[PDB]
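Issue 218. Parser rejects a valid record. Input:
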Amino acid sequence: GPNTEFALSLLRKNIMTITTSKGEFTGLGIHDRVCVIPTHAQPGDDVLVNGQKIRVKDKYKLVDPENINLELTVLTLDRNEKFRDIRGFISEDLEGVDATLVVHSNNFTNTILEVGPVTMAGLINLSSTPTNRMIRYDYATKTGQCGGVLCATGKIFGIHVGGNGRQGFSAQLKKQYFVEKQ
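Output the parser choked on:
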């Protein structure tokens, strides 16, 4: 419904295809030149944005200080035009809300899949790999939507970093991480 139309509007606005080592996935712009992408996707210091060589200004491999994986990487890409601050559209209120997984990769060209109500996992381990601040939705997903923009109408919950089976794992993109100066 309105979530789908928002996704298309967010698409043209802050979403672009990033060619990482894992493949060409979805990159969500947060504000200015600040974008976000998963870690195991392996983004370089210079990367291809829509196939175009571009260099990364600032690269924040964002995990918990204690080596606990958030599987998230925030990067300031060197692009002239700025992304619209969808930071005030971040929904750090997650659990109980219906979320839609919007993935725009080279393969998945804007696949808007409504997944249902998202819940908070918190800190869980995945095969001995400790992950902290994961948002989890119980939905049998066909894994491969790395970078999938988990959103709803005016609500960015985070991005699907790597879900598998009935556990769609998304990272919690809370505004705290995008606070420029604290």
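Fixed in the parser; the record now loads. The CA atoms of residues 122 and 133 lie 5 Å apart.
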